[PDB]
Amino acid sequence: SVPSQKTYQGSYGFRLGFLHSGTAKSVTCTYSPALNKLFCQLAKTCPVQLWVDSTPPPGTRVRAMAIYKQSQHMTEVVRRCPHHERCSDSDGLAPPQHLIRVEGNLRAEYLDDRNTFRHSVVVPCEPPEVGSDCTTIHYNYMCYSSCMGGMNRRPILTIITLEDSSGNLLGRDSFEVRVCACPGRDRRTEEENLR
Ligand SMILES: O=C(Nc1cc(Cl)ccc1O)C1CCNCC1
Ligand SMILES: [Zn+2]
């Protein structure tokens, strides 16, 4: 089966936000609003903001999952390639097969779905710190889009879901991701191509 990617703000007005990082050749993570696409280097911090109109209940969680973007591949589980799943770069919490990790959250939980076999990582939501109006989650992508025997140059989407304590849907958003050596250049190129 294939997880839904339908944008759904839900009762709390859930949506993502991204920093404005620019397209300098030295940039490690940059987001294109025109393409709804994140470009990032391997295993580098990707800040993603979580916005709501009103505070959800205690016990609310936020889950990230990757799927292939192209319909002929959507049924295939997105996983790390045969090289990176064996390179012993574990943080002690993420299974070595998972593409997406959460950085710096000891309450992160990693799921291997007993039925779909798809991978995801989920963390508890906490309301914003004093003075701030949103929260930020830091993601890492642990394979290149180009990795042979893995994503193999196929585009992926990240689906972010806001869930209640049972895992029921409260909200959903998504963005395309390219994990690459030069995010600044590739963003500039793809935005030019779109023009
Ligand atoms: O509660 C809020 N945000 C928020 C809460 C949680 Cl649990 C997770 C991510 C968030 O962005 C704002 C606080 C200011 N008034 C509107 C609601
Ligand atoms: Zn790889």
With residue 37 as reference, give the H or E element that holds it.
strand 37-40
Among 15, 48, 52, residue to substitute to test ligand 1 (most atoms within 8 Å of Cβ): 52
Query: What single string gives the DSSP state of each residue in 96-136?
Result: TT-SEEESS-TT-EEEE-TTT--EEEEEE--PPPTT-SSEE
3-state SS record for 48-71:
EEEECCCCCCCCCEEEEEEEECCC
Cβ(127) – ligand 1 distance below 6 Å:
yes
Distance (Å, whole) CA 44 – CA 29: 7
Is the separation of the CB atoms in 143 and 80 below 8 Å? yes
Tokens representing residue 151 in the block: 């994503």
- Tell me the structure's resolution in angstroms, rounded to a single decimal: 1.7
Let me know how many helices (H) and strands (E) the chain has, helices first: 1, 11
Burial 71-87 (b: 16+ CB within 10 A, else e): eeeeeeebbbbeebbee
Domains parsed from the chain with CATH numbers: 1-195 (2.60.40.720)
